């Protein structure tokens, strides 16, 4: 059967990271920086980097509200986690802001992604802090699909 963990709250508010206990990582043969595929409710998936967290109970997983929201889960729910070793570097991504001023790229997207090597999945909604406010974006498309690592050479289109 799949490998299952209890959703816990993150104290590190990074959109791209989930935390496990080192003992649980050993068991699951996951290592620092490994990309993992998380499965939640409503056939939702998320792709994140895994890091150890000495504050995490073996049976729990720390993830922020962005990740939880993407998986349609609440604190205390159960998710599955499996390795996702076939992730490619992104050639091109299409992101749109959730429309409900300034350069979205220069103020939000560039600083967010810059040398950050964040794994993303098509359909992700993520929140970027910046310019006093904070904005959410939806990942409309990635290439390769349906997920990729957003690298320094990855081309973003933010429109349409």
């Amino acid at each position: 059967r799949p490998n299952r963990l209890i959703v816990d709250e993150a104290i590190n508010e990074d959109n791209s990271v989930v935390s496990l206990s080192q003992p649980k990582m050993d068991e699951l043969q996951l290592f620092r920086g490994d990309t993992v595929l998380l499965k939640g409710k409503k056939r939702r998936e998320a792709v994140c980097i895994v890091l150890s967290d000495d504050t995490c109970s073996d049976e729990k997983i720390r993830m922020n509200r962005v990740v939880r929201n993407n998986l349609r889960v609440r604190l205390g729910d159960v998710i599955s986690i499996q390795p996702c070793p076939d992730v490619k570097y992104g050639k091109r991504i299409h992101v749109l802001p959730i429309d409900d001023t300034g350069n979205l790229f220069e103020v939000y997207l560039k600083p967010y992604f810059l040398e950050a090597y964040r794994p993303i999945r098509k359909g992700d909604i993520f929140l970027v802090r910046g310019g006093m406010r904070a904005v959410e974006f939806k990942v409309v498309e990635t290439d390769p699909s349906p997920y990729c690592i957003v690298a320094p050479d990855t081309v973003i289109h933010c429109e349409g």
Binding site: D14, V17, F31, R32, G33, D34, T35, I49, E115, A116
Partner: peptide, 18 residues
């Protein structure tokens, strides 16, 4: 040469140490 997962982890750790 370097291993990819380590690059991904190091970038995230930098974000958390800030």
């Amino acid at each position: 040469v370097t291993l990819r997962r380590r690059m991904l982890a190091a970038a995230a750790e930098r974000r958390l140490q800030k």
